[PDB]
């Protein structure tokens, strides 16, 4: 049939990923940026939306939602009649552990994003774009703004974008250190001037978004690829990838490989095909692999024998009870404490929770305390089942998707490494002289005169 992967250099998108050119506008025009943007703007927003519809573009923020459909949600029946401003909010906060794509997009090829704000904007016919950058990416923001100034200076963005009679302007709003501030309703509130606690939807942001105005939040990489798919065609984009997994995409290959880096590659590339061809191989050889976290901290860990013949896309990873997330492929060796790796993530999720809702503000700490115990083995194996259904109590009950973000990693670790955990409990149960009580108290706890309720 058809084998996916190894696309040529002449079908790539982010050419300047390795810093071969300075980020100034003059070199950007050599790369095709701002080439036919005037003709693109004159064509109606329907043409832009339908083009991204045919390309099969799905959001690389993590949910993977169809992109043309999402942007078209903002074009309601009587959108013209309302006098309120319309906003394109751009998700430049990349806080997902293992992820580094957008840092490269803004620091290397900024004018691609800058035109993407207009083209995504004109699509959803917004009147202003906001770029919410991670607060740590202070150097990245300065580059991106300098790109914006030249975009205003040359007339590309402003009161008359490329002479098209369109009103669009671009502003950057840096964050201040909150991973919850990547969630789309949390991203709205933070830019509004509040703590970044997410809103609940039935109110959907395409209607009541930023300052209660119609807005769309889209990730950097999704926005940045829009201008090229317009100028090159969505059929050409849809050439790459499987039937519902089209396009190229940026992969962060970090962890236990010989040469960790980030490279863009066609969707549905097999996991095997990717790491030892674009990254020098896993350290110690393929047989010395243990597990791969495919989409970042949120997606469940994937062991050796499942990752043997696994394609890296949205559908195959979802089929494997995992996800592509942002394809922050974290790869771990056979000589590393896997359980310690996941307990450091449930510690990450404890620190990033906003605290607004009960099942996450309490649950992200409860599971973090449990994971440090399972790290030491201070428990009985029945606790493993208790931790499985604590997480099921978290999914779907929270205001935002940061609840699943800390339930999924634990569920994967129980699903594929339960022999590991029970061994550590057995090692603990050997050392102190008996199976610990549920909670981490030693077997002699009642003997030593401590509170021990019947049952733990």
């Amino acid at each position: 049939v058809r084998t996916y992967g190894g696309l040529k250099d002449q079908d790539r998108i982010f050419q300047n990923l390795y810093g071969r050119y300075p980020p100034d506008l003059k070199h950007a025009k050599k790369m095709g940026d701002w080439y036919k943007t005037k003709e693109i703007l004159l064509k109606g927003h329907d043409w832009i939306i339908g083009e991204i519809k045919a390309s099969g573009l799905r959001g690389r923020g993590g949910a993977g939602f169809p992109s043309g459909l999402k942007w078209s949600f903002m074009n309601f029946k009587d959108w013209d009649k309302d006098n309120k401003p319309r906003y394109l909010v751009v998700n430049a906060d990349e806080g997902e552990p293992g992820t580094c794509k957008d840092r490269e997009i803004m620091r290397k090829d900024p004018h691609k994003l800058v035109e993407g704000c207009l083209v995504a904007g004109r699509a959803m016919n917004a009147t202003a774009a906001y770029i919410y950058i991670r607060g740590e990416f202070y150097q990245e923001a300065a580059i991106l703004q300098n790109a914006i100034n030249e975009a205003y200076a040359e007339g590309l963005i402003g009161k008359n974008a490329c002479g098209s009679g369109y009103d669009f302007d671009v502003y950057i709003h840096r964050g201040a250190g909150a991973y919850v501030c990547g969630e789309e309703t949390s991203l709205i509130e933070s830019l509004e001037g509040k703590p970044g606690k997410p809103r609940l939807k039935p109110p959907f942001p395409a209607a009541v978004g930023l300052f209660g105005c119609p807005s769309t939040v889209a990730n950097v990489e999704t926005v940045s690829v829009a201008p090229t798919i317009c100028r090159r065609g969505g059929a050409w984009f849809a050439s790459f990838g499987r039937e519902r997994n089209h396009g190229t995409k940026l992969f962060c290959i970090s962890g236990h490989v010989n040469n960790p880096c980030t490279v863009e590659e066609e969707m549905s590339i097999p996991m095997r095909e990717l790491i030892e061809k674009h990254c020098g191989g896993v350290r110690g050889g393929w047989d010395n692999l243990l597990a791969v976290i495919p989409g970042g901290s949120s997606t469940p860990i994937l062991p050796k024998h499942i990752c043997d013949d696994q394609l890296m896309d949205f559908d195959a990873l979802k089929d494997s009870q995992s996800g592509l997330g942002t394809a922050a492929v974290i790869v771990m060796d056979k000589s590393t404490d896997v359980v310690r790796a996941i307990s450091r993530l449930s510690h990450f999720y404890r620190h990033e929770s906003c605290g607004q809702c009960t099942p996450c503000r309490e649950g992200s700490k409860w599971t973090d305390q449990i994971m440090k115990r399972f790290e030491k083995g201070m428990g009985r194996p029945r606790e493993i089942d208790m931790l499985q259904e604590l997480t099921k109590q978290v999914e779907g009950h929270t205001i935002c998707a940061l609840g699943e973000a800390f339930a999924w990693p634990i569920q994967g670790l129980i699903r594929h490494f339960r022999p590991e955990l029970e061994a550590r409990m057995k090692k603990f149960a050997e050392e102190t002289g008996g199976q610990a009580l549920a909670g981490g108290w030693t077997h002699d706890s009642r003997q030593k005169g401590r509170l021990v309720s019947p049952g733990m």
């Binding site: 029945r382 606790e383 089942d385 208790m386 499985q388 259904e389 003997q447 019947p454 049952g455 733990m456």
Partner: protein
């Protein structure tokens, strides 16, 4: 041997307060499967109107008429309407002694006997009181033993 040691010297640490696995477990018992207090039975009430309808059109276990689709719903109120208007006494008077035989035909042509309260045989029933194999006074005293 007797009351030795006292309960005051019985070792506190030896005794164990038990839990049973289903109800006392930490990991496979949602409380709402085992909340039988809130799954209590309601009292099932049948008035004279209800029994007129039950004889008129049957029961969800056994109908008198097919009651297919429409023109059966209006027959279902025909059972309910006749019940309020007339008791079981008017109903039996006017449709004749034929359906006085039918009330007994529900329990096989005899009146039903009431339910017993034992189920030691597996079915609700009277207890079969019989003389025990060996009598404790023998025949020597006016007192028999019953099993």
């Amino acid at each position: 041997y007797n009351r030795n040691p006292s309960p005051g010297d019985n070792p506190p640490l030896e005794y164990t307060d038990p839990v049973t696995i289903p109800a006392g477990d930490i990991a496979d018992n949602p409380y709402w499967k085992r909340d039988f207090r809130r799954n209590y039975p309601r009292p099932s009430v049948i008035a004279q109107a209800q029994q007129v309808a039950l004889l008129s059109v049957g029961s969800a276990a056994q109908p008198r008429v097919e009651l297919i689709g429409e023109e059966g719903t209006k027959a279902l109120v025909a059972a309910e309407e006749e019940g309020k208007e007339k008791g079981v006494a008017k109903y039996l008077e006017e449709k004749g002694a034929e359906e006085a035989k039918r009330v007994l035909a529900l329990t096989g042509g005899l009146p039903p006997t009431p339910s017993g309260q034992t189920m030691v045989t597996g079915q609700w029933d009277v207890h079969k009181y019989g003389l025990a194999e060996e009598q404790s006074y023998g025949g020597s005293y006016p007192c028999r033993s019953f099993v």
